[PDB]
Amino acid sequence: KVGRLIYTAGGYFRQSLSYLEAYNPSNGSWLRLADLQVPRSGLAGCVVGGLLYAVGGRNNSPDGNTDSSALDCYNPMTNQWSPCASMSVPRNRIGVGVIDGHIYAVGGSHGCIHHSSVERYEPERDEWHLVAPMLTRRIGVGVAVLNRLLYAVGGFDGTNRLNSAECYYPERNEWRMITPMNTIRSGAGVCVLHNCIYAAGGYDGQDQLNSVERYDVETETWTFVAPMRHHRSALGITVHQGKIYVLGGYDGHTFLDSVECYDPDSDTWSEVTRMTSGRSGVGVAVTMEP
Ligand SMILES: O=C(O)CN(c1cccc(-n2ncc(C(=O)O)c2[C@H]2C[C@@H]2c2ccccc2)c1)S(=O)(=O)c1ccccc1
């Protein structure tokens, strides 16, 4: 369990960013690591087998917007990125989840297309294959895995921001709606902690949110927990040692550098560090130090 860092990849501030930076909760330090080969915002991060994966996004620059179908793999042992097989389609504002060593890429946008499609990556074969699409088209969708079930939460379908959520049952290759959230949330941070799916922040169609709610998969209810100190949409999120960390985002005024940490035992958020610069739309995951 020792020696793990919180990695933040990519993001946006004025343009899409290539940064890979890693935070050590044990000593408060930050390390700047190998840049992404292509800057990307609106991507997601995940880890399989100790390797960090950066999935999807878009490269916004002064000279273009290119939605990304890319899957790139970072090895902390070498501090190097390698390309992996690309997805079937570009997916900006993506969500991802891992089940049993396989990466699920969910939703996202390609130009004005809002995807319901979902695809699954097999690292052993370096192949993607499509699975059943969601019941709803969702961009800015929060994704998490609990008990080997995949959840897609909130987002934007092209017309409305969403409070709805749905669950994917892999052995049936089927999606089913779950109880909707109490709040419409697009671009929220979604993660799993203990037996609950948390949805932190986001945009409700009117304001960036500091509220946080959690879905208990046994009772099928959403309950609010303590709100974050900062309103934020397009935040990064991960779980480490029993606590939720939220990174950056947009509060309606500033691209935040704040990192807050949620303790479920006390139901409190604390501000624990700042990123080296404010940014939104990052991918975040946890793996060993490089
Ligand atoms: O991809 C990008 O359009 C910028 N990014 C992004 C990445 C992930 C999620 C999001 N998101 N969250 C909440 C919402 C929301 O409107 O409901 C969105 C964007 C996707 C939704 C959208 C809706 C209608 C028209 C256009 C877009 C944004 S960003 O570059 O990180 C950034 C964030 C905040 C301010 C500036 C830039």
**Residues forming a β-bridge with 59:** 66
Which own/partner pairs from 224-227 qualify as long-range (CB within 8 Å, at least 24 positions apart)?
224/182, 225/198, 225/262, 225/264, 225/267, 226/262, 226/267, 226/268, 226/269, 227/269
3-state secondary structure (DSSP) of residue 4: strand
Mention every residue, 6+ apart, whose C-beta is less than 8 A from residue 147. Answer: 217
What Å resolution does this PDB entry report?
1.4
Give the span between the Cα atoms of 283 and 51, in whole angstroms: 14
Identify the experimental approach.
X-ray
**Ligand 1 neighbours by CB, cut-off 6 Å:** 12, 41-42, 58, 92-93, 139-140, 156, 161, 186-187, 203, 233-234, 250, 280-281
Amino acid at 123: P
Separation of alpha carbons 197 and 216, rounded Å: 7
Q: How far is the CA of 87 from the centre of ligand 1 (A)?
A: 21
202-222 residues labelled b (16+ CB within 10 A) or e (exposed):
bbbeeebbbbbbbbebeeeeb
Q: How far apart are CA 190 and CA 165, in angstroms?
A: 11
- Among residues 189, 251, 246, the alpha carbon closest in space to that of 214 is found at 189
**Dist CA 158 CA 162 (whole Å):** 10
Displacement of CA 29 from its chain's centroid (Å): 22
Both tokens of 239, joined, read 């779980």
Reported residue count of the chain is 290
Owner of token pair 């037996």? 195
- Pick the closest to residue 96 from 38, 148, 54 (CA basis): 54
String of b and e for 16-54 (b: at least 16 CB within 10 Å)?
bbbbbbbbebeeeebeebbebebbbbbbbbbbbeebbbb
Distance 176 CA to ligand 1 centre (A): 26
Residue found by looking up tokens 């919180």 in the block: 6
Name the strand (E) or helix (H) holding 263: strand 258-263
